């Protein structure tokens, strides 16, 4: 039936075959499940890569719908997970048998980096003592906020960023299941602006399809507000080729015409600053100045002065690069 859902939740990989990228990790987890050798897992990686979807597909594969509420204990950062919960419901769930059917139980701890260190220290002997009865899956974005004692007990899988070559067919499946007219440059802009994230590629696809009705390069870069590659090349050419006043006028006209933001301009100019074969003394100064300009934009600071400083960081090094020869 038709449902009113966001496309990041309407199109969720309910099975392990619907995830795209981490084929070796998913093959190893599938062979863990099929041989009943599932250990305590530690899924870590950047957001939007499919860790919660992986553990929910594994839990739906392991357990039927008539027994899913008694075998799976799913706790996350929206739940209270203090040390009284580790000593309370989690220990009682781990230390007791099942109700309906005999089997091993699963305690999913989503956002395990949000737990306090007291709870993580209390979890160690709960994990180690009841390995036969229950299994634990810790999922985090930052591995440093998990204590090394819990990192030793759980085998860790790095759910790295999704490569855009493998991100395309899932987006094509979502497009063909939603009747969306998309061009090749629209798909390329989607997998460029996503940057290893399938949430942001679905959100941007749904937002562009609602705003314009078609998904092309211009529509995606207009709905997102991101500058194009040609605009960044023009900004760099103006900052390296002419004086302060003409470059300031041209960049100000380009920003007023297309409604660009200085954060995305700074990000793309930072990406361009390493491809350009600059001297090493020039690159250090440019990176320090651009990091300072990016830091100044985090508060109530006028963006026009920061645009002038972004021009100034290159107008300083123009004559240095030229006289270097």
């Amino acid at each position: 039936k038709i449902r009113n859902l966001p496309w990041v939740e309407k199109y969720r990989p309910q099975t392990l075959n619907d995830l795209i990228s981490h084929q070796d990790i998913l093959s190893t987890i599938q062979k863990f499940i099929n041989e009943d050798r599932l250990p305590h897992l530690l899924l870590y990686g950047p957001p939007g890569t499919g860790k919660t979807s992986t553990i929910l597909a594994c839990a739906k594969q392991l357990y039927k719908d008539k027994e899913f509420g008694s075998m799976v204990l799913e706790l996350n950062a929206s739940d209270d997970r203090g040390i009284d919960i580790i000593r309370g419901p989690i220990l009682s769930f781990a230390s007791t048998r099942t109700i309906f059917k005999k089997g091993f139980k699963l305690v999913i701890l989503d956002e395990a980096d949000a737990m306090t260190q007291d709870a993580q220290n209390a979890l160690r002997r709960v994990i180690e003592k009841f390995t036969e009865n229950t299994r634990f899956c810790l999922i985090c974005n930052y591995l440093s906020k998990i204590i090394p004692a819990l990192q030793s007990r759980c085998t860790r899988f790095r759910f790295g960023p999704l490569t855009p070559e493998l991100m395309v067919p899932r987006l094509e499946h979502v497009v063909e299941e939603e009747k969306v007219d998309i061009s090749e440059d629209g798909m390329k802009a989607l997998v460029t602006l996503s940057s290893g994230d399938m949430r942001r590629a679905l959100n941007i696809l749904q937002s562009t399809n609602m705003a314009f009705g078609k998904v092309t390069e211009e529509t995606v870069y207009t709905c997102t507000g991101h500058p194009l590659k040609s605009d960044i090349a023009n900004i760099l050419d103006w900052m390296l080729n002419q004086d302060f006043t003409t470059a300031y006028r041209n960049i100000t006209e380009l920003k007023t015409l297309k409604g660009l933001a200085l954060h995305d301009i700074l990000t793309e100019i930072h990406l361009f600053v390493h491809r350009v074969d600059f001297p090493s003394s020039v690159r250090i100064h440019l990176l320090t100045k651009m990091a300072d300009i990016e830091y100044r934009l985090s508060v109530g600071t006028n963006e026009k002065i920061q645009l002038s400083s972004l021009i100034a960081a290159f107008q300083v090094t123009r004559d240095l690069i030229v006289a270097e020869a």
Binding site: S70, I90, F93, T98
Partner: protein, 261 residues
Amino acid sequence: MFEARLVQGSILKKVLEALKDLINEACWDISSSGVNLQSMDSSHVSLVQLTLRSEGFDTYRCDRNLAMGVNLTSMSKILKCAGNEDIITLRAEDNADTLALVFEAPNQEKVSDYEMKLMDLDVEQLGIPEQEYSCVVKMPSGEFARICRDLSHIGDAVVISCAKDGVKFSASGELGNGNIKLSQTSNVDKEEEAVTIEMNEPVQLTFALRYLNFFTKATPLSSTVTLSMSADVPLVVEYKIADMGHLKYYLAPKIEDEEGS
């Protein structure tokens, strides 16, 4: 349109005070047969199956079947200010969120209409096996509550055994062990105080004391409780209300590992 009518308010107060520290939220399944509630606890160890009959209410009408999931702290605060001898009306519309509790003051003069907002949890149905048990014991509820309270002082996990002789409770704790065995207490003037053994095969299982003590809070609901045990199916505590329905408590055994030596 759902409209039930409790003839007295005491039984609903006892039910919602029995489940207050145990049940996270109440899922009233409504049909023409009666009111059903199958809900697990917050630890996913216990299970509560309450079945209230349509003949026990004053008036009961149910056009279409409903499944009303509601919070329990709010309903506990509503039922705290309810009398024990007043008629309490539960109302619910077809496509609305307001579950209405209408009752009277303890001064019995003014009316009170408390609405509740229904929750939208999608809960998969838990399959009760309804199989035969290897041990069925009919015993008084007050003696069961007393023996659970007396074993709570000794340990935390209790080994309850049952055989042809009778039920037996053990608590191997820090002070020491306490082993209490009861049998054939039917030779009294009362009919509620009696221990009857029906089934054959002896079973020994270890359970937590906190959940047993939460289960014993339904002592005023039934004078006689039933204990069902087997080697695979969990512990069932059955309270048979007089003319309203019944209440089943399911508690899973704990994981006990023998010594390697």
